[PDB]
Structure formats: C-alpha cells, structure tokens
Design a protein around this ligand. Structure first.
Ligand code: CL
Ligand code: CL
Length: 129
C-alpha cells in the first residue's frame, strides 16, 4: 500500500524500516508498527495477539480536522479493547494541530506521544493494563 508501510526492527538495534526493504528486518511480537505515508483518513480506509499499535508520524508535516478526528477514533476504538495506540515522531506542528483540534481534551492522551519508534516500543514494555 502507498498510504502506509509496515515497519519491522533490524535485530538488536533501534532501527525500524520497511519490512520489505531488508530480509532480516522482523516485526516485534505483540506490536504492529505502521508508517503513515498519506493523510490518516486514507490509511484508515485500508485499516477498515497485539497489545500495541505504533503509528510513525515522521513523514507527516501537518494534520487537518478530519485527520485528527479519524485518529481520535482509532485511538479510542483500539483502547476500548485494551490496545494502546502510540504516536511516534510527531513534529511540534503536528502536535499543535492535534491540540488545536482538541485531541488532548483528555490530557491523559499526552502519554501516547513518543519521540521515536524505539521510545514507543520501550514504552509498551510495562504499563497499566
Ligand atoms: Cl490529517
Ligand atoms: Cl524513529
């Protein structure tokens, strides 16, 4: 798909890349890592034993209201079955867009933000169930 890319980990590193870019790259059991390559409502359309979903926002330069609403729905619906959706690599601007569109109306959602994919992976290691 062009709207998202499944990422895996280069073994024994904090390097995460396209699962298809190199043979030894492997997904992490219990975690799904998706790189957003288009506005999330496009990638979400494709979405339509995992404990964590990590969304890599490194390619995202801004978000619009529809996208934030879509993301809020993804986070809520996964959360309602105990699955955490983490946001990795959001720029200051993207976080401003999330905030402006009231994504953090519940300030607890701030806890879903991580600087890097690896940080997000480590964040999932131990947490309130
Ligand atoms: Cl968006
Ligand atoms: Cl990263």
């Amino acid at each position: 798909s062009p709207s998202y890319t499944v990422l895996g980990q280069l073994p024994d590193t904090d390097v995460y890349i396209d699962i298809d870019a190199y043979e030894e790259v492997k997904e992490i059991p219990g975690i799904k890592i998706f790189q957003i390559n288009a506005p999330i409502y496009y990638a979400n359309s494709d979405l339509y034993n995992i404990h964590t979903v990590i969304l890599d926002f490194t390619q995202v330069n801004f978000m619009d209201s529809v996208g934030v609403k879509t993301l809020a729905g993804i986070v809520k619906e996964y959360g309602d079955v105990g699955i955490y959706v983490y946001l990795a690599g959001c720029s200051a601007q993207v976080v401003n867009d999330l905030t402006s569109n009231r994504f953090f109306e519940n300030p607890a959602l701030k806890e879903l933000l991580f600087h890097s994919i690896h940080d997000a992976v480590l964040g999932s290691q131990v947490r309130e169930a």
